[PDB]
Design goal:
The structure is cut from a larger assembly and holds 2 copies of chain A.
Chain A: H1 9-42
Protein name (chain B): Multidrug efflux pump subunit AcrA
Function (chain B): AcrA-AcrB-AcrZ-TolC is a drug efflux protein complex with broad substrate specificity that uses the proton motive force to export substrates. This subunit may act as an adapter protein that links AcrB and TolC stably together.
Subunit structure (chain B): Monomeric in solution. Homotrimeric; interacts independently with AcrB and TolC as well as AcrZ. Part of the AcrA-AcrB-TolC efflux pump.
Chain lengths: 53, 41
């Protein structure tokens, strides 16, 4: 939409803005998801080492 | 009557307390995890 200059470079700036931060929110999410899942990984206790129990 | 005699005077003496005690590092710190979890290594 910017090829033929049909928007505001300002505008496109704004669009990329969230599109930038959006994924970051995603990053905030996947980081989040792993967190609990990690805890669910904590649940189902893993032997932190190997050997005779 | 003839005897070995030592006439007495004031003699400064720095002898003083010899008392007990235990010794410590200084330098007597610890390592306390401030972050909780499994020790990986």
């Amino acid at each position: 939409l910017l090829g033929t200059q049909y928007i505001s470079k300002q505008e496109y700036d704004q669009a990329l803005a969230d599109a930038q931060q959006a994924n970051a929110a995603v990053t905030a999410a996947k980081a989040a998801v792993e967190t609990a899942r990690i805890n669910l990984a904590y649940t189902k206790v893993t032997s932190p080492i190997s050997g005779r129990i | 009557p003839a005897v070995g005699v030592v006439t007495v005077k004031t003699e400064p003496l720095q002898i003083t307390t010899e008392l007990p005690g235990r010794t410590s590092a200084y330098r007597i710190a610890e390592v306390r995890p401030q972050v909780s979890g499994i020790i990986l290594k």
